[PDB]
Design an enzyme around this catalytic site. Structure first.
Site, PDB file in Angstrom:
ATOM      1  N   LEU A   1      73.940  70.944  29.349  1.00 57.41           N
ATOM      2  CA  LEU A   1      73.499  70.146  30.488  1.00 57.41           C
ATOM      3  C   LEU A   1      73.118  71.004  31.651  1.00 57.41           C
ATOM      4  O   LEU A   1      72.152  70.707  32.374  1.00 57.41           O
ATOM      5  CB  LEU A   1      74.646  69.212  30.886  1.00 57.41           C
ATOM      6  CG  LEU A   1      75.046  68.210  29.829  1.00 57.41           C
ATOM      7  CD1 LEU A   1      76.270  67.417  30.261  1.00 57.41           C
ATOM      8  CD2 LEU A   1      73.859  67.296  29.475  1.00 57.41           C
TER       9      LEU A   1
ATOM     10  N   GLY B   1      77.765  75.586  35.789  1.00 51.87           N
ATOM     11  CA  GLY B   1      78.429  75.458  37.077  1.00 51.87           C
ATOM     12  C   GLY B   1      79.242  76.696  37.423  1.00 51.87           C
ATOM     13  O   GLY B   1      79.035  77.769  36.847  1.00 51.87           O
ATOM     14  N   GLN B   2      80.175  76.557  38.363  1.00 54.26           N
ATOM     15  CA  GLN B   2      81.021  77.674  38.820  1.00 54.26           C
ATOM     16  C   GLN B   2      81.919  78.241  37.695  1.00 54.26           C
ATOM     17  O   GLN B   2      82.124  79.460  37.615  1.00 54.26           O
ATOM     18  CB  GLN B   2      81.878  77.248  40.038  1.00 54.26           C
ATOM     19  N   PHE B   3      82.433  77.363  36.812  1.00 53.82           N
ATOM     20  CA  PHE B   3      83.324  77.803  35.739  1.00 53.82           C
ATOM     21  C   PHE B   3      82.630  78.128  34.434  1.00 53.82           C
ATOM     22  O   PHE B   3      83.285  78.630  33.539  1.00 53.82           O
ATOM     23  CB  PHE B   3      84.426  76.755  35.516  1.00 53.82           C
ATOM     24  CG  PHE B   3      85.293  76.577  36.729  1.00 53.82           C
ATOM     25  CD1 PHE B   3      86.211  77.555  37.093  1.00 53.82           C
ATOM     26  CD2 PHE B   3      85.224  75.416  37.486  1.00 53.82           C
ATOM     27  CE1 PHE B   3      87.030  77.384  38.200  1.00 53.82           C
ATOM     28  CE2 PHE B   3      86.024  75.253  38.607  1.00 53.82           C
ATOM     29  CZ  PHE B   3      86.947  76.224  38.935  1.00 53.82           C
ATOM     30  N   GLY B   4      81.346  77.826  34.306  1.00 55.34           N
ATOM     31  CA  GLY B   4      80.630  78.048  33.060  1.00 55.34           C
ATOM     32  C   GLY B   4      79.772  76.878  32.620  1.00 55.34           C
ATOM     33  O   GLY B   4      79.490  75.953  33.390  1.00 55.34           O
ATOM     34  N   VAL B   5      79.310  76.958  31.386  1.00 56.76           N
ATOM     35  CA  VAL B   5      78.382  75.990  30.804  1.00 56.76           C
ATOM     36  C   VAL B   5      79.039  74.603  30.611  1.00 56.76           C
ATOM     37  O   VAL B   5      80.210  74.514  30.255  1.00 56.76           O
ATOM     38  CB  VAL B   5      77.734  76.535  29.509  1.00 56.76           C
ATOM     39  CG1 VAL B   5      78.673  76.500  28.319  1.00 56.76           C
ATOM     40  CG2 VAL B   5      76.444  75.803  29.182  1.00 56.76           C
TER      41      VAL B   5
ATOM     42  N   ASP C   1      85.044  69.966  48.057  1.00 55.90           N
ATOM     43  CA  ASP C   1      83.669  70.450  47.892  1.00 55.90           C
ATOM     44  C   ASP C   1      82.746  69.259  47.656  1.00 55.90           C
ATOM     45  O   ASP C   1      81.967  69.254  46.717  1.00 55.90           O
ATOM     46  CB  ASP C   1      83.603  71.483  46.747  1.00 55.90           C
ATOM     47  CG  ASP C   1      82.309  72.287  46.643  1.00 55.90           C
ATOM     48  OD1 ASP C   1      81.527  72.308  47.637  1.00 55.90           O
ATOM     49  OD2 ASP C   1      82.072  72.885  45.567  1.00 55.90           O
TER      50      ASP C   1
ATOM     51  N   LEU D   1      88.741  70.720  42.244  1.00 55.15           N
ATOM     52  CA  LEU D   1      88.614  71.839  41.316  1.00 55.15           C
ATOM     53  C   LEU D   1      88.360  73.202  42.000  1.00 55.15           C
ATOM     54  O   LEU D   1      88.749  74.242  41.452  1.00 55.15           O
ATOM     55  CB  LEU D   1      87.498  71.495  40.298  1.00 55.15           C
ATOM     56  CG  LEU D   1      87.718  71.910  38.865  1.00 55.15           C
ATOM     57  CD1 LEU D   1      89.073  71.432  38.338  1.00 55.15           C
ATOM     58  CD2 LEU D   1      86.568  71.387  38.005  1.00 55.15           C
TER      59      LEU D   1
HETATM   60  C1  6MV Z   1      70.584  65.041  30.866  1.00 56.25           C
HETATM   61  C2  6MV Z   1      70.525  65.436  32.331  1.00 56.25           C
HETATM   62  C3  6MV Z   1      70.034  64.275  33.177  1.00 56.25           C
HETATM   63  O1  6MV Z   1      69.502  66.446  32.477  1.00 56.25           O
HETATM   64  C4  6MV Z   1      71.871  65.957  32.842  1.00 56.25           C
HETATM   65  C5  6MV Z   1      71.959  67.194  33.492  1.00 56.25           C
HETATM   66  C6  6MV Z   1      73.166  67.697  33.964  1.00 56.25           C
HETATM   67  C7  6MV Z   1      74.331  66.944  33.811  1.00 56.25           C
HETATM   68  C8  6MV Z   1      74.241  65.703  33.153  1.00 56.25           C
HETATM   69  C9  6MV Z   1      73.027  65.202  32.672  1.00 56.25           C
HETATM   70  N1  6MV Z   1      75.504  65.134  33.079  1.00 56.25           N
HETATM   71  C10 6MV Z   1      76.419  65.985  33.667  1.00 56.25           C
HETATM   72  C11 6MV Z   1      77.807  65.831  33.827  1.00 56.25           C
HETATM   73  C12 6MV Z   1      78.513  64.664  33.212  1.00 56.25           C
HETATM   74  N2  6MV Z   1      79.805  64.473  33.490  1.00 56.25           N
HETATM   75  O2  6MV Z   1      77.925  63.962  32.410  1.00 56.25           O
HETATM   76  C13 6MV Z   1      78.500  66.858  34.474  1.00 56.25           C
HETATM   77  C14 6MV Z   1      77.848  67.979  34.966  1.00 56.25           C
HETATM   78  C15 6MV Z   1      76.467  68.135  34.820  1.00 56.25           C
HETATM   79  C16 6MV Z   1      75.834  69.366  35.378  1.00 56.25           C
HETATM   80  C17 6MV Z   1      76.229  70.594  34.857  1.00 56.25           C
HETATM   81  C18 6MV Z   1      75.772  71.779  35.413  1.00 56.25           C
HETATM   82  C19 6MV Z   1      74.893  71.768  36.484  1.00 56.25           C
HETATM   83  C20 6MV Z   1      74.459  70.545  37.000  1.00 56.25           C
HETATM   84  N3  6MV Z   1      73.536  70.518  38.108  1.00 56.25           N
HETATM   85  C21 6MV Z   1      73.967  70.954  39.336  1.00 56.25           C
HETATM   86  N4  6MV Z   1      73.281  70.981  40.417  1.00 56.25           N
HETATM   87  C22 6MV Z   1      71.953  70.569  40.326  1.00 56.25           C
HETATM   88  C23 6MV Z   1      71.170  70.602  41.479  1.00 56.25           C
HETATM   89  C24 6MV Z   1      69.851  70.184  41.437  1.00 56.25           C
HETATM   90  C25 6MV Z   1      69.292  69.752  40.247  1.00 56.25           C
HETATM   91  C26 6MV Z   1      70.055  69.717  39.086  1.00 56.25           C
HETATM   92  C27 6MV Z   1      71.392  70.123  39.123  1.00 56.25           C
HETATM   93  C28 6MV Z   1      72.231  70.069  37.908  1.00 56.25           C
HETATM   94  O3  6MV Z   1      71.852  69.644  36.837  1.00 56.25           O
HETATM   95  C29 6MV Z   1      74.954  69.334  36.444  1.00 56.25           C
HETATM   96  F1  6MV Z   1      74.555  68.153  36.945  1.00 56.25           F
HETATM   97  C30 6MV Z   1      75.738  67.125  34.157  1.00 56.25           C
END
Ligand code: 6MV
Ligand code: 6MV
Lengths: 240, 258
Positions: free
Chosen positions: B14, B17-21, B123, B144
């Site tokens: 997906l 983040g700070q802790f990893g993938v 945060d 966290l």
């Molecule tokens: C499928 C889809 C919509 O592409 C998607 C994308 C990310 C995620 C996602 C679905 N669902 C989750 C969940 C969850 N509990 O389901 C938890 C963490 C993340 C996630 C993990 C790492 C970084 C970001 N991240 C961080 N900052 C950003 C600033 C600007 C643009 C994108 C991001 C940006 O994806 C994340 F969101 C995601």
């Protein structure tokens, strides 16, 4: 060989590992020692191999001083874990750390003794910053070590001097990356499947071309095409 | 609290983040989950594992639910509720003014719940809010940041510290409280009403702290009405004690909708 526990004082706790707590203490009222208080182990099998391990003596190997049979008494390493030391250096000091480990491993290779779990977490650092190899051959008496394993170990459980060579290249990468976890974006099962299909660790920022050629030589898909520790030591000595 | 990794499948990535993938996966062959890998060495794991017991019991419809942890092998994993529209910041950048207020309401309801449980987020920001398949916004990664080992993230002077979401007492004294989450919430409302602009754009992290020290604040987004700006602005009072609570903010948001 056998140390009497009345000749040990059990002072500061140093940490906890696979076999239990490790404490700092004094042996015979004068010598600094690390006392591994084993909780977890095939003790009878360890006790027989401990004589062989007592006789492994090299300046870059953490020295076993004796056993209480249970406790394992060893040389004290005041800067603790290499991984902690790297996370808390000039490029010349990083190569010296690789040299220290390589010298220990060339010695174990000369004695037909396999480490079986070589990694920066099993290397310790003394008060002078010298890196030494610890816990050699101890894993035989006990998923994350997938990241230090060649394909023949992951697929066939074939351990050899060449599987310690692979682990050594990953250890060099841990040193040059200043303690990054190898394959940060992969799980343990994904690491296993992806390295068998060609994934290798990228070249760290601090590694020169010649340094990367040495660590990369350790990761040949074929164990027979990997170098020995004599060759690696020689290559490291030529680079410095 | 413990999830056997044999009951998880680790599918697409997906993001990081700070802790990893972070990966999408399935739990017990049926439930969608997010699997957050904690790279070995990035977290104070023993202290996280003890607070995870408290985090398991934080349950509210606008909070991303913690389902469990995998701690018997390294790297450890945190398993949470899956949010199919990902990050709020991405969702904003890729809406009627009424929908923007509803997103503020969703976050406010989650934060009112964390405030009622004496649990600090630490945060809060649109990057830590997630959006589900129905467009509901939920708050994630609450508490966290207290377990991050990298000092660049943890210190108020660090290069990765969230200075743009921090009140003066956090920046000067590292004083976290319900009122430091209130400040972050006002910045989050501004992120929502500006459609995902970075706060204090053209300010470095240290020029932002100085701007705050001079009593200056984020400008009113043009999609925000006077009443909406009074609510976000109330979060940025120099004195923490003069900032509202999340119950009051929720009430004010509910009145503006009416
Ligand atoms: C499928 C889809 C919509 O592409 C998607 C994308 C990310 C995620 C996602 C679905 N669902 C989750 C969940 C969850 N509990 O389901 C938890 C963490 C993340 C996630 C993990 C790492 C970084 C970001 N991240 C961080 N900052 C950003 C600033 C600007 C643009 C994108 C991001 C940006 O994806 C994340 F969101 C995601
Ligand atoms: C005084 C100081 C520097 O705080 C310290 C700390 C640990 C130790 C220490 C000094 N000296 C020894 C010796 C010895 N023979 O003297 C043997 C084992 C350990 C030891 C025992 C358990 C766990 C780890 N351990 C394992 N993996 C880690 C990954 C990352 C960070 C720390 C660790 C991490 O301490 C150990 F190092 C230690």
């Amino acid at each position: 060989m056998e140390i009497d526990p009345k000749d040990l004082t059990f002072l500061k706790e140093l940490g906890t590992g696979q076999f239990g707590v490790v404490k700092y203490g004094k042996w015979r009222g004068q010598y600094d020692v690390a006392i591994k208080m084993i909780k977890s182990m095939s003790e009878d099998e360890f006790i027989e191999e401990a004589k062989v391990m007592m006789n492994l003596s090299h300046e870059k190997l953490v020295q076993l001083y004796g056993v209480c049979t249970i406790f394992i008494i060893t040389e004290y390493m005041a800067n603790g874990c290499l991984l902690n030391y790297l996370r808390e250096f000039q490029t010349q000091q990083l190569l010296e750390m690789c040299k220290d480990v390589c010298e220990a491993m060339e010695y174990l290779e000369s004695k037909q003794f396999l480490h079986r779990d070589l990694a920066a977490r099993n290397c310790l650092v003394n008060d002078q910053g010298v890196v030494k190899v610890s816990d050699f051959g101890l894993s035989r008496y006990v998923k994350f070590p997938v990241r230090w394993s060649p394909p023949e170990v992951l697929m066939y459980s074939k351990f050899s001097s060449k599987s310690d060579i692979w682990a050594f290249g990953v250890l060099m990468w841990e040193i040059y990356s200043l303690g990054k976890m190898p394959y940060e974006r992969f799980t343990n099962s994904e690491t296993a499947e992806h390295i068998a299909q060609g994934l290798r660790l990228y070249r760290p920022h601090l590694a020169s071309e010649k340094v990367y050629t040495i660590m990369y030589s350790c990761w040949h898909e074929k164990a027979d095409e990997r170098p020995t520790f004599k060759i690696l030591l020689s290559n490291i000595l030529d680079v410095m």
